[PDB]
Ligand binder design. Structure first.
Ligand SMILES: [Mg+2]
Ligand SMILES: [Mg+2]
Ligand SMILES: [Mg+2]
Ligand SMILES: [Mg+2]
Ligand SMILES: [Mg+2]
Ligand SMILES: [Mg+2]
Ligand SMILES: [Mg+2]
Ligand SMILES: [Mg+2]
Ligand SMILES: [Mg+2]
Ligand SMILES: [Mg+2]
Ligand SMILES: [Mg+2]
Ligand SMILES: [Mg+2]
Ligand SMILES: [Mg+2]
Ligand SMILES: [Mg+2]
Ligand SMILES: [Mg+2]
Ligand SMILES: [Mg+2]
Ligand SMILES: [Mg+2]
Ligand SMILES: [Mg+2]
Ligand SMILES: [Mg+2]
Ligand SMILES: [Mg+2]
Ligand SMILES: [Mg+2]
Ligand SMILES: [Mg+2]
Ligand SMILES: [Mg+2]
Ligand SMILES: [Mg+2]
Ligand SMILES: [Mg+2]
Ligand SMILES: [Mg+2]
Ligand SMILES: [Mg+2]
Ligand SMILES: [Mg+2]
Ligand SMILES: [Mg+2]
Ligand SMILES: [Mg+2]
Ligand SMILES: [Mg+2]
Ligand SMILES: [Mg+2]
Ligand SMILES: [Mg+2]
Ligand SMILES: [Mg+2]
Ligand SMILES: [Mg+2]
Ligand SMILES: [Mg+2]
Ligand SMILES: [Mg+2]
Ligand SMILES: [Mg+2]
Ligand SMILES: [Mg+2]
Ligand SMILES: [Mg+2]
Ligand SMILES: [Mg+2]
Ligand SMILES: [Mg+2]
Ligand SMILES: [Mg+2]
Ligand SMILES: [Mg+2]
Ligand SMILES: [Mg+2]
Ligand SMILES: [Mg+2]
Ligand SMILES: [Mg+2]
Ligand SMILES: [Mg+2]
Ligand SMILES: [Mg+2]
Ligand SMILES: [Mg+2]
Ligand SMILES: [Mg+2]
Ligand SMILES: [Mg+2]
Ligand SMILES: [Mg+2]
Ligand SMILES: [Mg+2]
Ligand SMILES: [Mg+2]
Ligand SMILES: [Mg+2]
Ligand SMILES: [Mg+2]
Ligand SMILES: [Mg+2]
Ligand SMILES: [Mg+2]
Ligand SMILES: [Mg+2]
Ligand SMILES: [Mg+2]
Ligand SMILES: [Mg+2]
Ligand SMILES: [Mg+2]
Ligand SMILES: [Mg+2]
Ligand SMILES: [Mg+2]
Ligand SMILES: [Mg+2]
Ligand SMILES: [Mg+2]
Ligand SMILES: [Mg+2]
Ligand SMILES: [Mg+2]
Ligand SMILES: [Mg+2]
Ligand SMILES: [Mg+2]
Ligand SMILES: [Mg+2]
Ligand SMILES: [Mg+2]
Ligand SMILES: [Mg+2]
Ligand SMILES: [Mg+2]
Ligand SMILES: [Mg+2]
Ligand SMILES: [Mg+2]
Ligand SMILES: [Mg+2]
Ligand SMILES: [Mg+2]
Ligand SMILES: [Mg+2]
Ligand SMILES: [Mg+2]
Ligand SMILES: [Mg+2]
Ligand SMILES: [Mg+2]
Lengths: 55, 119, 113, 207, 123
RNA sequence: CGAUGUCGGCUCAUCACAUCCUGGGGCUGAAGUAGGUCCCAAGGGUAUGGCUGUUCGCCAUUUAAAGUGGUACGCGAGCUGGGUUUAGAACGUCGUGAGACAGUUCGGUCCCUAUCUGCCGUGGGCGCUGGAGAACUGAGGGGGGCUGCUCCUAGUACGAGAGGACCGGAGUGGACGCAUCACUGGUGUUCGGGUUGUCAUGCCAAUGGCACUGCCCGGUAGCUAAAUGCGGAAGAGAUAAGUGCUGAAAGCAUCUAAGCACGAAACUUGCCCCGAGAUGAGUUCUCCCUGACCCUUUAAGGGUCCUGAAGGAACGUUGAAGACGACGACGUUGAUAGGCCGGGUGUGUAAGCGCAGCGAUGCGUUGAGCUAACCGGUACUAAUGAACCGUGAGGCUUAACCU
RNA sequence: AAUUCCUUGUCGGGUAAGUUCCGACCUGCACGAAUGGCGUAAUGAUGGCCAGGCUGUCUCCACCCGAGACUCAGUGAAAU
RNA sequence: ACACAGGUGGUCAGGUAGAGAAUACCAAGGCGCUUGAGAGAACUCGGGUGAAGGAACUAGGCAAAAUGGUGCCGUAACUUC
RNA sequence: AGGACCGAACCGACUAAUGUUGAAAAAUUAGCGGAUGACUUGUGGCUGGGGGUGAAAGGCCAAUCAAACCGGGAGAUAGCU
């Protein structure tokens, strides 16, 4: 169940090539409150599709 | 496997899951908007909406039935007094799921669920 | 779907009577011995009624010389011809599978009035 | 050539004998022909069919231009059937359901219902070891998958756990019970592949 | 659905009371037997002064199963006891002269005309 | 020997031909049937139990047959651990004795999170010489192949009889495999009901909690097998052993050296499935981009301004798709999901009231109430106007049409 | 026979079938009389066998509930 | 060795059923076990149910399943009574 | 009355499964035996290494016992690696 030789930094980098992240593409800038948020997510102030819903 | 089934397990045995669903429904009826995770609120939709549909016709049998569903006289009286006539003319769909980011301690994708006649 | 319900109701039967699980029923069915379509009479209590439209069934169980016989008739099949209710029974259940482990006097049922 | 139906549901057909037939209800709309391929243009003799109707704001511009040059209404897919010699189909034709007004057996091809990451006992019909009598952490595992040191390799095609189903499978020679020219139905007998809403290619039989 | 080491009762007056199937006949890895199937049985118990002795081995046709048999419509016929009718080891005719209990219509062939004629009922 | 775990069982197997069946034959001290023996052939198939630790065996009973071998007497980083081969103990025997016995009973820890190769599945990258979306052809690979019985031919051929054919045709079974839920059923701790103990909702009533779902009883969808559909083929090619036709070296003869015909479940096909990463990167169809300069080393070169198409990707509602990716449906021009309405099914006459009895309980309202995942509908909520990757006519040499 | 190699001795019961079990035969390789012989009711987390009840132990697995496994976020080993 | 499902002697011993300090629910009291969110694949662990058959499994009924209480009737071979 | 009976405290450790680099250098779970006695346990004392103690297994004597542990002879010796 345990390894036989020591694997190279070549093999370790090749395996880690896939675990790197992808960024969030582009934040939706809300039209009437000018601030950035994710797609379909309410902002920090509380706006979503214009209207303030929340306190 | 999960072919044509419905109802999220939510990492809980069934007694605990039913008890926390009626507890979250009581908390929603009291505080009028709650903030929870996303699949918990997505399962709360199909639980807190039958209560308002049941209390959209007020009677003694339906009032004892909502007492069976929610186990609390405050939730029952608040339902059949104020959440009856407010959603009288509303053909279902009394909740409004709003996604709001993530939780800082376990990265759970949060959600703000309210009633539509809130403000 | 509605297509299945169309093909279902175009050949579902039309004179199914009101037998309730417990109401003893005499069924006349078509047995072919040699080349003669004749009737056989299977009478006994009805212990299981299942409704799926055309796929409906009911399980008549009798005692024919000690060895009891169940038989699940498909209702809208044309292999049954006649259904008749001898007496009107009344249990407080819906599928009397408890009648199997009882025989004789301990498996009668109070009449419905 | 065949038709492209959509498997609605299974039900019974009763006859006057009293028999019961498990009948699958393959609805078959008017299959449009979009492009007829011959030897000098393309390389074989085979036609292309389509059914249904997709949304205009969902059909993309290659597909929509293909259908609009083909001269039919915008369908929902494409399928391709070989032409046995003795069929000259026009590019505007619309293959009805009455093609099966003479055959007795059809061969039905469709996507089987995918059952997940099914193990060996569910997939390749292995057996189990004992559930008592000492057996420890090995109630349903595969077991010995090879020999000692010669081969020294698991032979290719060894039966193992994987994805059961969700693959095109074909049942051969199911008897056609009815052809409904009014409801656009083909009523076959048996158990065709696919669930409700699957797309099934129905061909006239080979064997 | 009768296997090896079933314990059938006996539906004729041949002499046995409680027989045990030992080998279904008909094919390799033959598992079950419906009705109208020839199995081989041993005899656990007898009536004292009968045609058969406890401890012999002789064939028997199954006539009644608790699994029931499906008609070409779907009317299955459950019973309450797996039964059988004893036979001879070579000539293969029923040894008894009288059959207790009912019998199905699956048994009716060219082969079992004696059993279907000697049954009281046929169901 | 700074270690490769040693018998047998289970679970998986795979190969060989010196074949056990099925296929084809030649001879027979082969009438038929059943055979005997020999030649070709490995595509499939090849038993359940009793006793022992067993392999082996004997036995009971089937089967078409219950193959012979390898593969570390296959397989313990897969599984018992009965036997063998630890420490206890005893019997026979040996030894004065410690002890010993391929003699014997009784008892006795079987560890490991898989780096690499291998294998089963499934994805990302880039390639395929503009890009994108679809269908394909199929180089190549895999799967599958088994067979009993009954009847017709026909009690005919044969035989004195009993018995009993070859060849061919039909049906019904076994085993194996694929598919499905319409039937029979199982499950169905999310639906309905009964019921015990106890606690709580002030109390009666009605309900909820907890006791493996408290214990039962039914059961929808789904998944399923014991349930029901289907399969194995037919045919074609080239053949093996064998059979031949014509025919000479060898005036005859001769199945062969010239030529040709027949011949098997074996091989190539036919049936199913994968399949252009098939770098030999294929074929056809469709759609989209038709702008400016600036520079030096002039090149299939670099940089700037405008442009951002086809489409993809991301996000969201999700799915009879699913480990995560992936594949599919849908995003207001909308039924994708939840809700709601009508239905269906399930359970089996709710609550409250009235009557009847002392009372438990019954009766009327009542096939009532409740009804998850199913069916057909309805925008009531949730699927945002965007922003993002992708570009701006696609090299050279030859040849054919054009003028 | 916890002693018995030949030996699965032979005969009988039990089972369709019983190298084990029980009852006898004595041909005791190599039992045997306080390192006791042979009996024996009770008792045994003991040894061998049979039968009734029971059941997914099995023919043959199927579904369902939970804890892991799998995905995201935090911390983060090991023998080799 | 650890903020470790282990070990450690005395005293106090409520309610409802129960014979009981067992057991089930509770009061006073004290806690929710110092990683969570999903998804609901294989496979493993703890469990529930199962057609028809019932030891065919196997070294061996190992494991599971069943039997379970209070009062009465009744009870054999053998026996050291 | 009893080294009587069934059974919780308490003492154990018979079977199975889980763990076995675990939660634990022998445990948890479900069953199991004794449970007024040759019982069990608190606290203090005693027996010292060829010695103790032993309802006897070469067992136990500080996670070690066919002769403990710590220092010393001591850099024992080693035809062996
Ligand atoms: Mg090395
Ligand atoms: Mg990685
Ligand atoms: Mg759904
Ligand atoms: Mg978790
Ligand atoms: Mg509970
Ligand atoms: Mg799926
Ligand atoms: Mg098995
Ligand atoms: Mg283990
Ligand atoms: Mg296990
Ligand atoms: Mg190995
Ligand atoms: Mg090699
Ligand atoms: Mg060695
Ligand atoms: Mg080494
Ligand atoms: Mg050969
Ligand atoms: Mg011969
Ligand atoms: Mg071979
Ligand atoms: Mg070969
Ligand atoms: Mg071998
Ligand atoms: Mg060898
Ligand atoms: Mg070996
Ligand atoms: Mg040897
Ligand atoms: Mg082994
Ligand atoms: Mg190995
Ligand atoms: Mg051993
Ligand atoms: Mg010893
Ligand atoms: Mg030795
Ligand atoms: Mg790997
Ligand atoms: Mg790729
Ligand atoms: Mg091939
Ligand atoms: Mg079904
Ligand atoms: Mg269905
Ligand atoms: Mg059912
Ligand atoms: Mg249930
Ligand atoms: Mg079902
Ligand atoms: Mg209660
Ligand atoms: Mg009360
Ligand atoms: Mg409570
Ligand atoms: Mg052929
Ligand atoms: Mg000649
Ligand atoms: Mg000549
Ligand atoms: Mg030829
Ligand atoms: Mg063949
Ligand atoms: Mg071939
Ligand atoms: Mg619309
Ligand atoms: Mg909807
Ligand atoms: Mg109904
Ligand atoms: Mg109620
Ligand atoms: Mg009422
Ligand atoms: Mg009424
Ligand atoms: Mg109803
Ligand atoms: Mg409804
Ligand atoms: Mg719908
Ligand atoms: Mg011996
Ligand atoms: Mg004997
Ligand atoms: Mg003896
Ligand atoms: Mg002796
Ligand atoms: Mg002696
Ligand atoms: Mg002496
Ligand atoms: Mg035995
Ligand atoms: Mg992580
Ligand atoms: Mg802690
Ligand atoms: Mg602790
Ligand atoms: Mg108390
Ligand atoms: Mg307690
Ligand atoms: Mg699970
Ligand atoms: Mg169980
Ligand atoms: Mg069962
Ligand atoms: Mg049941
Ligand atoms: Mg049963
Ligand atoms: Mg036995
Ligand atoms: Mg056995
Ligand atoms: Mg066996
Ligand atoms: Mg046990
Ligand atoms: Mg138990
Ligand atoms: Mg005592
Ligand atoms: Mg314990
Ligand atoms: Mg006791
Ligand atoms: Mg010393
Ligand atoms: Mg010793
Ligand atoms: Mg020690
Ligand atoms: Mg010494
Ligand atoms: Mg030294
Ligand atoms: Mg010295």
């Amino acid at each position: 169940a345990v390894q036989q030789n020591k694997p190279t930094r070549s093999k370790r980098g090749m395996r880690r090539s896939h675990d790197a992240l992808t960024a969030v593409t582009s934040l939706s800038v809300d039209k009437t409150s000018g601030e950035k948020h994710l797609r379909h997510h309410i902002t920090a102030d509380g706006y979503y599709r214009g209207r303030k819903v929340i306190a | 496997m999960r072919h044509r089934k419905s109802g999220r397990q939510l990492n809980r045995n069934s007694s605990h899951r039913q008890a926390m669903f009626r507890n979250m429904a009581g908390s929603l009826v009291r505080h009028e908007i709650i903030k929870t995770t996303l699949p918990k609120a997505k399962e709360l939709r199909r639980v807190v909406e039958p209560l308002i549909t049941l209390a959209k016709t007020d009677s003694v049998a339906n009032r004892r039935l909502a007492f069976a569903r929610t186990r609390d006289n405050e939730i029952v009286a608040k339902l059949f007094n104020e959440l009856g006539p407010r959603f009288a003319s509303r053909a279902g769909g009394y909740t409004r799921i709003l996604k709001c980011g993530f939780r800082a301690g376990d990265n759970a994708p949060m959600a703000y669920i309210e009633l539509v006649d809130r403000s | 779907s509605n297509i299945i319900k169309q093909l279902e109701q175009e050949q579902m039967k039309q004179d199914v009577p009101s037998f309730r699980p417990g109401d003893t029923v005499e069924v006349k069915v078509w047995v072919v011995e040699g080349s003669k379509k004749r009737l056989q009479a299977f009478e006994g209590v009805v212990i299981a009624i299942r409704n799926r439209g055309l796929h409906s069934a009911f399980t008549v169980r009798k005692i024919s010389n000690g060895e009891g016989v169940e038989r699940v008739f498909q209702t809208h099949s044309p292999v049954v011809d006649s259904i008749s209710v001898k007496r009107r029974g009344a249990v407080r259940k819906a599928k009397l599978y408890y009648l199997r482990e009882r025989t004789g006097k301990a498996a009668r049922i109070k009449e419905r009035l | 050539i065949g038709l492209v139906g959509k498997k609605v549901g299974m039900t019974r057909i009763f006859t006057e004998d009293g028999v019961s037939i498990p009948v699958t209800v393959i609805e078959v709309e008017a299959n449009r022909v979009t492009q007829v391929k011959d030897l000098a243009n393309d390389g074989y003799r085979a036609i292309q069919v389509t059914t249904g109707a997709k949304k205009a704001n969902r059909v993309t511009k290659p597909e929509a231009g293909h259908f609009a040059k083909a001269g039919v209404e915008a369908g929902r897919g494409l399928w391709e059937f070989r032409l046995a010699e003795g069929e000259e189909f026009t590019v505007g034709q619309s293959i009805s359901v009455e093609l099966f007004a003479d055959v007795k057996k059809v061969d039905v091809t469709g996507t089987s219902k995918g059952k997940g990451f099914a193990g060996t006992v569910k997939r390749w019909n292995f057996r189990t070891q004992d559930a008592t009598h000492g057996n420890s952490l090995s109630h349903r595992v595969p077991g010995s998958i090879g020999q000692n040191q010669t081969p020294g390799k698991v032979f290719k095609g060894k039966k193992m756990a994987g994805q059961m189903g969700n693959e095109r499978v074909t049942v051969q020679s199911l008897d056609v019970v009815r052809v409904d020219a009014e409801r656009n139905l083909l009523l076959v007998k048996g158990a065709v592949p696919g669930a409700t809403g699957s797309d099934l290619i129905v061909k006239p039989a080979v064997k | 659905m009768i296997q090896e080491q079933t314990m059938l009762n006996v539906a004729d007056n041949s002499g046995a009371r409680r027989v045990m199937c030992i080998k279904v006949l008909g094919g390799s890895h033959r598992r079950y037997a419906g009705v109208g199937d020839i199995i081989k049985i041993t005899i656990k118990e007898a009536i004292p002064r009968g045609k058969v002795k406890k401890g012999d081995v002789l064939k028997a046709v199954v006539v009644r199963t608790k699994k029931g048999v499906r008609r070409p419509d779907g009317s299955v016929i459950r019973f309450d006891g797996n039964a059988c009718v004893l036979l001879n080891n070579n000539s293969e005719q029923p040894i008894g002269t009288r059959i207790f209990g009912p019998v199905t219509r699956e048994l009716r062939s060219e082969k079992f005309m004696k059993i279907i004629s000697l049954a009281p009922e046929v169901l």
